[PDB]
Design a protein around this motif. Structure first.
Motif, PDB file in Angstrom:
ATOM      1  N   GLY D  22      33.610 -22.023 -21.460  1.00 11.88           N
ATOM      2  CA  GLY D  22      34.183 -20.852 -22.099  1.00 11.88           C
ATOM      3  C   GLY D  22      35.361 -20.285 -21.327  1.00 11.88           C
ATOM      4  O   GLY D  22      35.940 -20.970 -20.472  1.00 11.88           O
ATOM      5  N   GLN D  23      35.742 -19.045 -21.629  1.00 11.16           N
ATOM      6  CA  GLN D  23      36.821 -18.366 -20.920  1.00 11.16           C
ATOM      7  C   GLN D  23      36.384 -16.954 -20.560  1.00 11.16           C
ATOM      8  O   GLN D  23      35.697 -16.302 -21.341  1.00 11.16           O
ATOM      9  CB  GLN D  23      38.097 -18.292 -21.754  1.00 11.16           C
ATOM     10  CG  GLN D  23      39.214 -17.562 -21.039  1.00 11.16           C
ATOM     11  CD  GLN D  23      40.540 -17.677 -21.761  1.00 11.16           C
ATOM     12  OE1 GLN D  23      41.008 -18.781 -22.063  1.00 11.16           O
ATOM     13  NE2 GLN D  23      41.159 -16.532 -22.042  1.00 11.16           N
ATOM     14  N   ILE D  24      36.796 -16.476 -19.388  1.00 11.19           N
ATOM     15  CA  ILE D  24      36.518 -15.099 -18.994  1.00 11.19           C
ATOM     16  C   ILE D  24      37.687 -14.603 -18.153  1.00 11.19           C
ATOM     17  O   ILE D  24      38.132 -15.286 -17.225  1.00 11.19           O
ATOM     18  CB  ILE D  24      35.184 -14.964 -18.225  1.00 11.19           C
ATOM     19  CG1 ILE D  24      34.803 -13.480 -18.075  1.00 11.19           C
ATOM     20  CG2 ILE D  24      35.257 -15.705 -16.875  1.00 11.19           C
ATOM     21  CD1 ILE D  24      33.367 -13.234 -17.597  1.00 11.19           C
ATOM     22  N   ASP D  25      38.213 -13.434 -18.506  1.00 16.42           N
ATOM     23  CA  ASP D  25      39.318 -12.817 -17.772  1.00 16.42           C
ATOM     24  C   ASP D  25      40.440 -13.819 -17.469  1.00 16.42           C
ATOM     25  O   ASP D  25      40.886 -13.974 -16.329  1.00 16.42           O
ATOM     26  CB  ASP D  25      38.787 -12.153 -16.505  1.00 16.42           C
ATOM     27  CG  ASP D  25      37.850 -10.996 -16.823  1.00 16.42           C
ATOM     28  OD1 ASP D  25      38.105 -10.299 -17.827  1.00 16.42           O
ATOM     29  OD2 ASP D  25      36.856 -10.790 -16.093  1.00 16.42           O
ATOM     30  N   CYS D  31      29.514 -23.769 -17.022  1.00 19.20           N
ATOM     31  CA  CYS D  31      28.207 -23.554 -16.421  1.00 19.20           C
ATOM     32  C   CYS D  31      27.330 -24.761 -16.699  1.00 19.20           C
ATOM     33  O   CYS D  31      27.454 -25.411 -17.745  1.00 19.20           O
ATOM     34  CB  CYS D  31      27.533 -22.284 -16.960  1.00 19.20           C
ATOM     35  SG  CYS D  31      28.448 -20.749 -16.587  1.00 19.20           S
ATOM     36  N   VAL D  45      20.742 -22.608 -12.476  1.00 22.35           N
ATOM     37  CA  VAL D  45      21.992 -22.430 -13.207  1.00 22.35           C
ATOM     38  C   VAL D  45      23.105 -22.115 -12.211  1.00 22.35           C
ATOM     39  O   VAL D  45      22.921 -21.303 -11.297  1.00 22.35           O
ATOM     40  CB  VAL D  45      21.864 -21.324 -14.276  1.00 22.35           C
ATOM     41  CG1 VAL D  45      23.207 -21.024 -14.924  1.00 22.35           C
ATOM     42  CG2 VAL D  45      20.826 -21.725 -15.343  1.00 22.35           C
ATOM     43  N   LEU D  89      26.661  -9.156 -17.864  1.00 28.86           N
ATOM     44  CA  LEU D  89      26.235  -9.886 -19.051  1.00 28.86           C
ATOM     45  C   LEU D  89      26.451 -11.378 -18.868  1.00 28.86           C
ATOM     46  O   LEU D  89      25.712 -12.196 -19.429  1.00 28.86           O
ATOM     47  CB  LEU D  89      26.981  -9.377 -20.287  1.00 28.86           C
ATOM     48  CG  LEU D  89      26.885  -7.872 -20.527  1.00 28.86           C
ATOM     49  CD1 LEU D  89      27.520  -7.499 -21.846  1.00 28.86           C
ATOM     50  CD2 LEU D  89      25.426  -7.443 -20.467  1.00 28.86           C
ATOM     51  N   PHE D  90      27.466 -11.739 -18.092  1.00 31.57           N
ATOM     52  CA  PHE D  90      27.673 -13.131 -17.719  1.00 31.57           C
ATOM     53  C   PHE D  90      26.530 -13.614 -16.839  1.00 31.57           C
ATOM     54  O   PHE D  90      25.931 -14.665 -17.086  1.00 31.57           O
ATOM     55  CB  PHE D  90      29.018 -13.244 -16.999  1.00 31.57           C
ATOM     56  CG  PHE D  90      29.400 -14.639 -16.597  1.00 31.57           C
ATOM     57  CD1 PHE D  90      28.866 -15.208 -15.468  1.00 31.57           C
ATOM     58  CD2 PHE D  90      30.323 -15.368 -17.345  1.00 31.57           C
ATOM     59  CE1 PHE D  90      29.214 -16.477 -15.077  1.00 31.57           C
ATOM     60  CE2 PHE D  90      30.678 -16.649 -16.953  1.00 31.57           C
ATOM     61  CZ  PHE D  90      30.124 -17.197 -15.814  1.00 31.57           C
ATOM     62  N   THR D  93      23.360 -14.117 -18.768  1.00 35.24           N
ATOM     63  CA  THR D  93      23.367 -15.317 -19.603  1.00 35.24           C
ATOM     64  C   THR D  93      23.228 -16.575 -18.758  1.00 35.24           C
ATOM     65  O   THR D  93      22.503 -17.510 -19.126  1.00 35.24           O
ATOM     66  CB  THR D  93      24.664 -15.372 -20.415  1.00 35.24           C
ATOM     67  OG1 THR D  93      24.768 -14.211 -21.248  1.00 35.24           O
ATOM     68  CG2 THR D  93      24.714 -16.618 -21.292  1.00 35.24           C
ATOM     69  N   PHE D  94      23.914 -16.608 -17.617  1.00 38.54           N
ATOM     70  CA  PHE D  94      23.986 -17.797 -16.790  1.00 38.54           C
ATOM     71  C   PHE D  94      23.356 -17.449 -15.448  1.00 38.54           C
ATOM     72  O   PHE D  94      22.125 -17.413 -15.337  1.00 38.54           O
ATOM     73  CB  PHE D  94      25.438 -18.273 -16.692  1.00 38.54           C
ATOM     74  CG  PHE D  94      26.037 -18.655 -18.020  1.00 38.54           C
ATOM     75  CD1 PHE D  94      25.590 -19.775 -18.693  1.00 38.54           C
ATOM     76  CD2 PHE D  94      27.061 -17.907 -18.576  1.00 38.54           C
ATOM     77  CE1 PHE D  94      26.154 -20.141 -19.920  1.00 38.54           C
ATOM     78  CE2 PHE D  94      27.633 -18.271 -19.799  1.00 38.54           C
ATOM     79  CZ  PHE D  94      27.171 -19.384 -20.466  1.00 38.54           C
TER      80      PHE D  94
END
Ligand SMILES: CC(=O)N[C@@H]1[C@@H](O)[C@H](O[C@@H]2O[C@H](CO[C@]3(C(=O)O)C[C@H](O)[C@@H](NC(C)=O)[C@H]([C@H](O)[C@H](O)COC(C)=O)O3)[C@H](O)[C@H](O)[C@H]2O)[C@@H](CO)O[C@H]1O
Ligand SMILES: CC(=O)N[C@@H]1[C@@H](O)[C@H](O[C@@H]2O[C@H](CO[C@]3(C(=O)O)C[C@H](O)[C@@H](NC(C)=O)[C@H]([C@H](O)[C@H](O)COC(C)=O)O3)[C@H](O)[C@H](O)[C@H]2O)[C@@H](CO)O[C@H]1O
Ligand SMILES: CC(=O)N[C@@H]1[C@@H](O)[C@H](O[C@@H]2O[C@H](CO[C@]3(C(=O)O)C[C@H](O)[C@@H](NC(C)=O)[C@H]([C@H](O)[C@H](O)COC(C)=O)O3)[C@H](O)[C@H](O)[C@H]2O)[C@@H](CO)O[C@H]1O
Lengths: 114, 114, 114, 114, 114
Positions: D22-25, D31, D45, D89-90, D93-94
């Protein structure tokens, strides 16, 4: 911004069933179509455009991961941001969904945000 | 410009049957030959030249996608712009068609401009 | 310059039988050995050196394509320019041939210049 | 810093069982989830973010090797640095684990720091 | 400098048996372990560090080639320069050998310097 933002949509238990690569306005792009593994629902179309959208920085990683999941046929969760692409004939052929992430899916859960 | 412009041509239910890689005028390039999956029609040849034509920005993605579809032997739609390449011995060996997109086909499907 | 120039030599109906990767004078390089698919004749040895010769721009595409055809074992036409490399120990281990193109072959012809 | 520093953690005899991109900032990230080859223990993880953390320079090599081991299904040792990622939240999730290395494992030993 | 310099060492008829990817001193690195195809002799270990040693320019090509030969398990000649890496915990985990070349082997010879 994040793939996982709740302003993004996602679809679980999908199989990447088609893949397209092309160019628009000096930018390579690709598009995928996914369908439910079990045959229900309606297809999902999402595209990534190398020089466009806030998601442009992950273009290569998404294309490589799309090819990977396309080649295995495994079930995945597709993550999109709706209403991004704006050229009407492009949207008509494909959709306005930007692809923003891809997750593998276990037997009963997907490895990604929900 | 767009792969799907109505001034580009397309051919469906094709199989990438040959692949060539070389260099011309300091540019790596590749060419492909496609034939109808069912043995009908006439072969289609299209080339991409890194550094030449409006389609130069998509060279890497198209080379990667051509190799992928070449490896599987699956049916595809090839998108071309005719009358692009100039060098007559190059055209005579291959064609004047620039490769401008590649789309998968699912049972004479074809996921691309139409 | 062009892979298909009549000052370059070519050899049809060959298979890539060996592959080597190394470095010389700060440049990654690779070499391949090809033999006739039927075992007749003499091997063709050709090399590509990342920062050297007029064929430097296509180093990456030639390396990728050589690996592709090596892993499939399929018949190809190899194109070379003779008398390029000069370091005697290198030339004696491999040859002076620069690799300038690779074409897939059917049973009846090869998809490339001749 | 080094993958093998004793301030990092590792888990042997694991199999990469899930993969997400995915993408973040503005950064692509990926992952993985890993589980014991023998079904024991709890899943691990770890994530890599392209321009974040001291480990950013190895983002591409780690993603390629994660995909490689993911596709073979072979037993590996996974190396992580704990408590790196911070967006909650990241992390939910991971995880907060940064991926810092991957080692192949035989039935008796893993080929990496211990 | 050259892979084939007589100041470099080599080991013929080896199989790549293990692979490790990590980071050290802000640089991606990989290591391989090889054993004789006959199951004799002591293992050979060699590493490549992006950003370090005169062989740094060929890091990507050696990693790609090591991965390939690892996946096929074919016999190869490993070329190394001894006594390059010096961090003792690293050397004790892996070795001081810098990887400087990889050559495929047949039954008569290996396709590389000797
Ligand atoms: C009669 C009834 O209740 N019909 C359904 C109801 O069964 C569905 O509930 C569950 O949805 C489950 C999967 O949920 C997602 C998913 O993970 O894919 C959540 C997503 O947030 C959602 N995406 C959007 C934009 O809404 C997505 C889609 O709704 C769904 O995948 C359809 O996609 C397409 C294009 O066909 O579903 C799972 O499907 C369970 O089977 C469901 O029981 C409910 C939500 O789908 O909607 C009711 O209409
Ligand atoms: C009596 C008659 O009408 N004969 C044919 C007629 O059957 C054909 O109709 C159908 O065409 C299908 C394929 O359509 C395309 C394609 O997607 O491949 C549409 C393309 O626009 C077209 N491209 C161009 C530049 O013309 C392309 C080619 O015409 C075709 O692929 C042949 O090309 C080569 C190099 O061999 O066809 C499909 O073949 C159906 O089975 C046909 O029923 C019609 C269109 O081909 O032409 C009539 O002459
Ligand atoms: C009664 C008792 O002592 N039970 C266990 C004990 O069996 C375990 O000993 C052996 O551990 C072996 C694996 O060692 C590592 C590993 O390489 O995986 C060493 C790592 O340093 C360690 N990692 C961390 C962060 O501590 C790692 C984990 O403990 C382990 O992999 C489990 O991780 C998860 C998520 O499940 O183990 C191997 O498992 C032998 O079969 C064991 O006999 C001992 C260490 O695991 O812990 C005791 O509780």
């Amino acid at each position: 911004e994040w793939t996982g933002d709740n302003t993004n949509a996602y679809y679980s238990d999908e199989v990447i069933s088609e893949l397209h690569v092309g160019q628009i306005d000096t930018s390579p792009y690709f598009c995928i179509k996914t369908v439910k593994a079990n045959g229900s629902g309606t297809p999902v179309v999402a595209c990534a455009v190398s020089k466009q959208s806030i998601w442009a920085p992950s273009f290569k990683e998404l294309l490589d991961q799309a090819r990977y999941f396309y080649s295995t046929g495994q079930s995945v969760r597709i993550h999109v941001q709706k209403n991004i692409w704006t050229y009407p004939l492009f949207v008509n052929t494909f959709s306005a969904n930007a692809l923003v992430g891809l997750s593998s899916c276990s037997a009963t859960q997907c490895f990604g945000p929900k």
